Design a protein around this ligand. Structure first.
Ligand SMILES: Nc1ncnc2c1ncn2[C@@H]1O[C@H](COP(=O)(O)OP(=O)(O)O)[C@@H](O)[C@H]1O
Ligand SMILES: Nc1ncnc2c1ncn2[C@@H]1O[C@H](COP(=O)(O)OP(=O)(O)O)[C@@H](O)[C@H]1O
Ligand SMILES: Nc1ncnc2c1ncn2[C@@H]1O[C@H](COP(=O)(O)OP(=O)(O)O)[C@@H](O)[C@H]1O
Ligand SMILES: Nc1ncnc2c1ncn2[C@@H]1O[C@H](COP(=O)(O)OP(=O)(O)O)[C@@H](O)[C@H]1O
Lengths: 323, 323, 323, 323, 323, 323
């Protein structure tokens, strides 16, 4: 069937390779050395002959690229153009100086040009590196993930036993704090017989304890809401929503309201209460919420969310809310 | 008259068989062995050479299909196209990677293609098997359906008598819990002299006690609201609405507010209170509810619903709300 | 003037006869025997060779039509097609499987086809028979219409004296309970010098005690609201609104608010209070109500409605609300 | 200048007489005898060979017209067409069976045709006779207008003096009660030095005490709001708004809120309180009121209206609300 | 530069003169004698051979123009046509019988024609004469502007010292009461070093104590809001808003909310509190206010307005609100 | 690489210089002497042969330009056109008499022409000079910036330490008070290791303590919301939003609600409380805020804003709100 399968994919593969190879070459040329670096979370070029890399230890390390032709205005613009085209977009110095796209393997990219940047010779690029490593929960415990807590042994038992039972857990905190890395490690305590369905923007979640699952990805014309809606027609036991953002908020609400089994999700929020308040906000941005009261929404989540885990800028839990 | 009926149906039957036979063959070809299985509730192929089946006992059973040509990419894709075309739709790797359709006999089907799936060689399919068996209420009793209740004899008498009198009953719980199977066995206590009108998507309700009845089905351009609206112009005694979903919620509301006799329906809700809240929500998503207060809607349902029955994940009633 | 009047109507009559005669023949062919039956309220064909008739005594009587060619698929489809065309509509197995229309003399008809009905050989038809008989109030008294009341002689005097004075009365209850038949009998106590204007969908109201009146009928492009609005420009003493349904609700509201004389109307409602609540609902579905509070509407009707009469399924008054 | 004025008006007069004379003849032909009658308030033909006239004493008088060619269907229809065309409209048995128009001299006219009327041979017409007579306030006093009041001398002094000072007065009650006739006689107490601007549909208000004034009439594309808006740009002292209807309500509100001197108007309301509620309602039907609370609107009118006068069906004041 | 400047304006001047001269001649012909009159505030022609002039002493003085050809229908229509054209409008007896325009020097004009006026030979015209005289504050004091006050010397010191400091003052009252004349006189107490920017419809404000200022005027396609918005980009010390009316209300609100320096404005209102209520009303008519509460708006103005001055119909202050 | 960079920029530079040089000459020609002046904040020409300059000490200084050809009407008009064309706009005496644009180096410019100005020979121009100087925090201290406070040493320590920790600070006051100059000097206390991203209209913020940063500018089709939205996809540590205006308010809100690190911004508000109210207002003008309560928005900001600093018209802090 492989031979017969190769002829089946021949046309579609060919079309991707023609569109992606120019971008694979430009990406390696400019950022190969940096994308090879260990424990990095972001790479940024500020348009001034210096590349800034952000380590997981919260430190920014600059690199001089003054003597490289890859950081020549014409090479940078080629790269930008390869990025836009890959996602069927355009980037120019008029109606499209800001561009959102992805590299060949999925990492998100943000490019800005003149007139939006300070001047003529300044091109701005920033790439976000996905969570590509899985640390076992045991590791978190050893690194003292729960030490800033008063009920350390109570937190560690609520998480493990809570998720085994299928409670709706939310992991929140600021960017690059470890939310995605954390939800991944706790998937250990989901029974191995559970059917799991994930909704992501970029492949990050790995399945090492489950054989019955399906990954769903959004982008371009397929929204997050589309996937979630499709997900409900695919009989899941658990639903892992990569991260909440906007209108998906409301659709998420109803999924908890139909009394559905254990949902895992990440979200940007400063604390438990800022979360319950943030869930109501994002939820109002979606049409089918107009006739619903803000207090009605906040009181809903507070009744459906079984536990919230917040993480500070030092990658440690400093609040373990439980209902 | 059968000779004349046959010539009357000649053109429509020919058009359906032309469009449905490519589908019947492909469906048999891939899932014939699985659709023959007993006591199943779902069939899922996760695009990785294994077919997962969900049994009524809540267990998933994997089946290896590595040495089958039916699960070859070209054969799967032929099946997907046959699924789309049957419902006058299209499925492709661009603007239509997600598809909702039905098999020849009604079972709902969900298909996802790349770029939404994880990759190029991954096609995801999931089929939902309808409630095709009728178990007599006596059977539920014997299986200990009400054993988890403090008022067992009181519940069993509220149901039998309540429904004989024509009270508005609702059965909620999660997917595959047995709500449809339950409302079916309960129809025994509806007087045989009652005209019954049902509204379903897939044929599931059988009539073994009633001779005066009409079934209405929705799909495509015909909404559930449409059938409900036609229903009211058909003079029913009882109305069985297969399952509440979005906009129908509000039309449902009015039918209760007009004093109408015993309505029976199913809903996805975690509990009595979550139901009263859920009915208010879905009811707000429909236009002619704009000027209505959420508190007005929730209390309206509370006064009109005579009794709610919730079912856990073990197929047992764990709450018998009565007004 | 009759000769000169016949030539005036010649063209319009001819056009109706060409359109209505095919329907007069098809109607007699299939349902003549049933439309001749005494004390019936509805006739239904479920598409299974049996015609069900509903008696005023609440009993359904089946009739076997297995040996009739009028109930042949081709004869049934002809009938359906004659119904649609008469109201300038279309009925088919695609975008128009549900049809609402009327027979030649006004009775409302509801036809449903495949794919909405269960299958290929099932055509559903249901005809509602209008109130065509007038029972004198005395009759209601003799049949014990008010016996289930604690203040029987008080009810009988409030109705008679109340309507003589011109109070806003509402008759409510479920379908086929006798609301229309009741409002008709009480018209006896409206002074014979009153100018009366009725708004109906189907001619049912007769005038045996009044000489100064005008009947108004709605349908197709002329809504109920249109008639009511026209009615207010025709100087009425009393207004008899056949039955409240939707947007007419609000227009009805203002008619009571301008402090207008005695209005009679029927409505589907389970009880007094469900009525005041139902009047507010229907009233919000009409645009010019957006800026009005639900409590503002309910409190209005409660101040303008002078008495409500509710009727149960046994055709007896079981609640006589008075303000 | 009259010779030059005549040539200036030649083309417009010719165009009006061409369009109005077919109407003057048909109107004379059918209703000449009835429009000559004294003390009438309405003329109705119910399509059944009888013309009903409503006298100021509240009695209806029938007149047999069975042997008149004017009430022949073709002659009635000619009259209807002449009515429609005069106001650049159309009347037919399809999309325009209901017509609102005016006779040559202004009287409003309402015409209804089949299918809206009961049948083919039924044409309904109703004509409203304007307040064409002025009775001096002294006459109202002599007829016992205020005899139903506890504070007779106090009412009669509040009116005379109140209006002399310029307070905002409203006259309400039902159709044909005498509100317009009342506000007319009351104008006696408005100082003769006041510039008065009126807004009517039909000419009814006469000026026997004032020399500085301008009349504004609305109809067709010119709304009441239009005239009110122009009015404010004409520097009035007093404003007489013939009668409040829909949207004008809100524009009316603002005029009171700007401190403007004594406004006089008529409204259809059952009582003082029903008026304050009715003004809030009609005021909400106009856009620029969306963001205004119903309680805000009701209280606004209460503080601004200086005195309301209600009139029963016997043409007597039965409530004299003063602030 | 004057010679070079004349050639620069040659084309635009020529175009205005061709459009304005016909109107300069028609205006002098009909109203020259009246526009020359001293202390007048309005001139009105009611279409009945009499011109009414309104003196500042509140008296209307009629003038007979029966023997003038300028008041011939053809001369009046020429004048009307010259007015419409000047503002690029049209005036006729169909879709444009109401016209708002201005004479050559700015005065506002309102013309109404048949069918809106009573009849065929009646043309209505009304011209408002702008405040063209500046009385020094001392004069107001001598005429006893503050005598009806209990704290006369307190009022006179609050106004003088308050405006010197830059407090937000509002002058209100009815038309022709002296609001504009009053704000003009108090500009004496604005420090002469202040940059002043006015927003007017008609030039009325004079600058006799300030050298650094710019006048802004609205009309046609340039709204009041446009000017105010432009004004905020022209670094003003004080802002004098000729008069508040509608949507400008809200824009005005924000200008006070950004904590901006001393604003002077006039408004039509019966009293202090009617003003705070009127400011909230007009403010809601502007889109960007939808999500703001009426009580939220009223409480805002009440916190930002430092003092209100109301004037009665005798040109005297009868209420001096201070916060 | 500079040779290749030059050829890469050849076409864009040529296009800008073609469009910008006519502007550089005209600008030099009229305002060269004034743009060279020290410590100015605005330049205004009021169309009357005098140029007004506003000095940092709040004084306006007039300069006579009567004998200059640059202020000739044709030369001023050439300059206006050059201003409009540079920003792809048009300025004329019809539909575009008001213009908002910028000079060659960024300074904002506002131009008004007749009919908006008082007359034909009057062209109004006003130029805003950007904060182009950086004064060290120590300088503010020496000038007595905090001397008007009761808690001087407490304010000076809350600022230094507060900002070092990353609290959300806001600087408000009126135009030209020194908010931008203040936030600039305060950046000293932001750790040098922080990645800073700024959003301005005109380049004003300098970076003398930070090496990792990116500037974003908005104008034309690129909104402030756009840059803020791109900003969040660039991984900043601190975000400096030049100044809050309309819609950005709400996007700003969310950024605070996501727990994001220390944001610094400027706003036009009279005081702390006026700010919290002002943030709620501007935030409501943006769509996705519809379903949010004004009280919900005001309290949201209060909990998230860590400290507000207001500045009077003498360039001194007169209120130091801390949470
Ligand atoms: N009480 C029961 N005992 C054994 N099997 C059951 C029972 N109730 C339902 N089932 C089986 O479980 C499956 C799911 O039931 P169904 O009524 O369709 O669920 P729901 O509508 O709530 O998703 C069916 O195939 C049915 O035959
Ligand atoms: N006080 C009165 N006495 C006798 N006749 C009256 C009196 N008031 C009104 N009428 C007559 O009654 C009719 C209706 O009066 P009108 O003022 O037009 O009523 P409304 O505007 O309230 O409908 C008129 O023809 C008028 O001449
Ligand atoms: N104090 C005063 N004494 C005499 N005449 C005045 C006085 N104040 C105003 N007037 C005159 O009265 C008229 C009132 O108009 P105006 O001042 O513009 O008031 P508003 O804007 O409120 O209509 C003007 O023609 C003005 O010249
Ligand atoms: N504390 C200060 N002392 C002296 N001059 C100042 C001070 N603060 C600001 N300035 C000057 O005043 C002008 C306006 O300051 P700026 O920060 O741009 O105001 P804002 O943004 O609030 O309008 C600038 O030209 C600046 O150089």
């Amino acid at each position: 069937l492989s031979a017969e399968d190769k002829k089946f994919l021949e046309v579609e593969r060919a079309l991707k390779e023609a569109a992606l190879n120019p971008l694979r070459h430009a990406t390696e040329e400019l950022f190969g050395d940096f994308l090879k670096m260990e424990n990095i979370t972001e790479i940024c070029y500020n348009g001034n002959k210096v590349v800034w890399v952000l380590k997981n230890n919260g430190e920014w390390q600059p690199f001089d690229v003054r003597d490289r032709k890859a950081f020549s205005l014409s090479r940078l613009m080629h790269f930008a153009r390869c990025c836009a085209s890959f996602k069927k977009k355009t980037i120019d110095n008029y109606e499209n100086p800001i561009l959102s796209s992805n590299l060949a393997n999925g990492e998100r990219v943000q490019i800005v040009l003149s007139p939006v940047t300070v001047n003529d010779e300044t091109i701005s690029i920033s790439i976000r590196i996905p969570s590509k490593t899985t640390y076992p929960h045991s590791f978190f415990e050893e690194q003292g993930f729960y030490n800033l807590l008063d009920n350390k042994e109570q937190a560690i038992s609520a998480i493990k036993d809570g998720i085994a039972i299928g409670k709706n857990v939310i992991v929140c905190g600021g960017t690059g704090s470890g939310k995605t890395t954390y939800i991944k490690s706790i998937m250990e305590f989901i029974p191995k017989e559970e059917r799991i369905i994930s909704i992501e923007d970029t492949e990050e979640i790995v399945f090492k304890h489950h054989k019955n699952y399906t990954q769903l990805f959004f982008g371009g014309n397929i929204t997050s809401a589309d996937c979630l809606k499709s997900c409900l027609r695919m009989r899941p036991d658990r639903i892992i929503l990569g991260e909440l953002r906007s209108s998906e908020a409301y659709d998420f609400y109803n999924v908890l309201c139909s009394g559905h089994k254990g949902t895992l999700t990440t979200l940007h929020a400063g604390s438990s209460e800022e979360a319950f308040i943030r869930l109501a906000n994002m939820s109002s941005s979606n049409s089918a919420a107009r006739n619903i009261k803000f207090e009605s929404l906040i009181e809903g989540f507070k009744d459906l969310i079984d536990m919230i885990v917040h993480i500070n800028h030092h990658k440690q839990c400093d609040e373990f809310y439980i209902k």
